[model samples]
Structures are given as structure tokens and as C-alpha cells.
Target: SMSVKKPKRDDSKDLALCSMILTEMETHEDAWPFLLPVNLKLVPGYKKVIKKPMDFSTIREKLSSGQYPNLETFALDVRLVFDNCETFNEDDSDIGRAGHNMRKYFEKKWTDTFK
Candidate 1:
């Protein structure tokens, strides 16, 4: 069950995972495994969902690569990542909606979250 705490950015453990992945992407390639989506399962709809954790550098690269992910694609990618996780249990539809929620959280926090 997900916690009921307000979904606000507060440098929490989950966000820490995001930060760590970013740092690893920029400073250490060996740590990428520990950051990017883990337990990949060579399947569709689960090909790109983020299940482990991520950091700033990787996020920066993904954003700065000129991908320009719109609200829809952003959430979709997130769902895809979650789908790829070896331990994934939820349906893509549910996780995909959750991705939208996560996307909104960042969209609102981006100003301070990135800097």
C-alpha cells in the first residue's frame, strides 16, 4: 500500500533515489545499474519503466537530450519502466496512471526540484 503522506517534494528517500541515479549518470557509469530501472524483462509495455531508482545526471541527460517529453510521453515512459521491472505485479494501466500522477508531482516541483 502506498503511503498517505502528501506527495510533495521534501528530499525524501524516494526522491533521493532519483538524485542518486542522476549523480551516478554524471560521475559513475558503474553505478548506473543501481540507479536506472532494474530487473529488466525483455517484454513490451515494460521496456522502459523505472523500478529501481534514478538521479539528477541521468534525468538531466534524458531531459537535455532534446527529447522534450510532453505530459503524455513523460507519464508513458514512466509506466513502461515500471512494467519492465522483474517484480512488477500491477497492470500497465494502473501503473501508467500512477506515472501520470508522478509526472504531475515533478511538473509542479521542477523549478526547485532540478536546481
Candidate 2:
């Protein structure tokens, strides 16, 4: 049996784990996980920039880049991204179910790492 070393303060590790989960969820779209479009007004000149099927790779990238200075804030942002997805209607949507699973994974990892 092999065991791994734990950190004294695993805040960064938590952030990375959370970010990885988010990245997985975002990339799960390749399997056609739910579907929804987000409207963005870029430059404020266009009527609307319709980005079909929202993705959170940017958030994951930012998290990986150390752009988020706080652990809780990064967690909140990850939740926000999933919450913003209109496709996940609890157990009614596949993506929603998958999102919940990922959420649990993140929560468990965060708590376990800190504990």
C-alpha cells in the first residue's frame, strides 16, 4: 500500500483541483452535454454576440494561471459558472447531473485536502 504526503496549507492544491473539475465539465460538451447559448455584448456595438453552448475553459485557464488570489472566491466562481448554465435543471438534465457530480467531487476534494 502506498500513501501520499499532505500539505500543511492546501489552498493552492484545492484551487487547482477545483479548476481541473471545471475544465472537465467545460470540455464534456464534446459529448453534447446539455445545450444553451449565452448572449454577450462585446464592444457594446453589436446587438448581441451569441456564443452557443457556454464553455468555461477561460475560467479554468485563469485559475491555472494564478489569477484568483482566494480559494473561496475561486470556488464561488466555479459554482457561478455551473449555475449560469441554463441547461442543468437538476436531475432533469444530463449536464445538470454531471455538474452535480463534479460539484461533489470538488467539495469532497476541498474538504478532504483541508482536513
Candidate 3:
């Protein structure tokens, strides 16, 4: 008999961790800006500046759709959110502060949970 269903131990674990971390960040207060794609009308030039704007909501959908091949791939998309924030905001600004805070929490959480 041919083996049809391969083991998905790694895939399932990655999905679970992705879901866990995403939920935590979505519920974060400062996560408002990163919840969805930035509004083009509200923030002019955002589209021109950030070609690939990653956000928590989209990441969650990507995870559900099985877009990520591994945990690290999922992680890079998550990192994109913070990187875009830095590119668009001043470190001391309100949105910028939240970006920094969220990034700090994410890294700490990632190391503690995924490391």
C-alpha cells in the first residue's frame, strides 16, 4: 500500500503557534494600526512607501489558508509589520511608540514561546 498522508507534525505545530501569537497581538491595544491594511485615503503616500504592507489580520488569514511552509516563513511576515512601522513613523511619535512596544512584546514572546 502506498503511504498517502504524510505526517504534519511540524505544519500543525506552526499553525498553532501562529494562531496563538496572532490572537495575542490582535488583542493588544497598540495593535490597532497593525490590525488591517493601512487606509490609503487616511495616509497618503503609504501605498507608495510600503509596497508590501503586512498586518496581523492578513497574517491570520494566510495561516488559515496554509500559505506558510514553516514557522520561520510565518515569522518574517510578522516582522514586516514592525519594519514598515519604522519606515513610516518617527520613533517618538504615538504610533511609533506603539510599534516599538508591539515589536518588543512580539520578540520577547517569540523567544519565550517559540525559542
Candidate 4:
């Protein structure tokens, strides 16, 4: 007989996969809008529109610190980056277009990696 101990919270692989997604996302051609926080000085009204802002930089910070509890939670934060953009930007504008592209890319990547 073989013995195996399934981990209850052995989520290191989940974290590793999430980290891979971020690295790939950062390199996407349309990743500029999400590279960092919106320019509050330039887009002064952004804070008012998107209350809970999420970006590649912030995600990177949290991920780097191993703050994500699991990939599902991490995915929520990732999706929020796109959802926040949809709320703040229009489909025709430059940032909006990039947001769409990035979101599409991420969804596909997430699925391919996990599913």
C-alpha cells in the first residue's frame, strides 16, 4: 500500500502559477494601462470613480510578499484590475482597449494554466 498526505493549505503551487500569470501579463503589449496606479495627478477624478483600484504593481507587491491566501483569491484581485478599468474607461478609448485585450489575455492564460 502507498501512503500520501494531501495538504489542506499547500498552496505554494497556486502561488507559483499566479506569479507566472503576472510575469506574462506584465509583458503583454497592452499592459501599459495596468503597469502601475493611475496617475492621480493627471486623472484626478479616477479615485472617485474607481474606489478600489487594482493594478499590476499592487498585485506584484502583494504577490511578492506571499500575501495571497490562494489562487482563487488572487484571481479575484486580477479580475478586479480589468473590472476596475471597465468601470473607469470606455471601450473606444486607448486605455479601455488595452483593458479589454489584457482581460481577454488573462482569462485565456488563467484557463490554460489551470484548466
- Number of residue pairs clashing in candidate 2, backbone atoms closer than 3 angstroms, sequence gap of 3 or more or interchain: 0
For candidate 4, what's the RMSD? 4.2
Superposed model 3: Cα runs more than 4 Å off: 1-11
Q: Ten consecutive residues with minimal summed lDDT in candidate 1?
A: 25-34
Better of 1 and 3 by TM-score: 3
How accurate locally, in lDDT, is each candidate? Answer: 0.42, 0.55, 0.89, 0.88
Compose the digit string of candidate 2's lDDT tens values, residues 1-115: 2577665564546665666656555555332332233334332421242223333655666677988777777776656545644333556676666667666655676676555
Off by over 4 Å in 4: 1-10
- Root-mean-square deviation per candidate: 13.0, 9.2, 4.3, 4.2
Model 3, CA-based lDDT: 0.89
Q: Against the correct fold, how does model 4 do in TM-score?
A: 0.86
Clashing pairs in 3: none
Tell me each candidate's TM-score. Answer: 0.29, 0.51, 0.86, 0.86
For 2-92, candidate 1 gives per-residue lDDT tens digits of 7777666653343444444334333533333324443346544443544444333344556456453343443344434334332444435
The runs of at least 3 residues in candidate 2 whose Cα sits more than 4 Å from the true structure, single-residue gaps closed, are 1-55, 86-90
Model 4, 1-99: lDDT tens per residue? 257766566555887788889999999989998999887778868878888889999999999997887788788988999999999888999989998
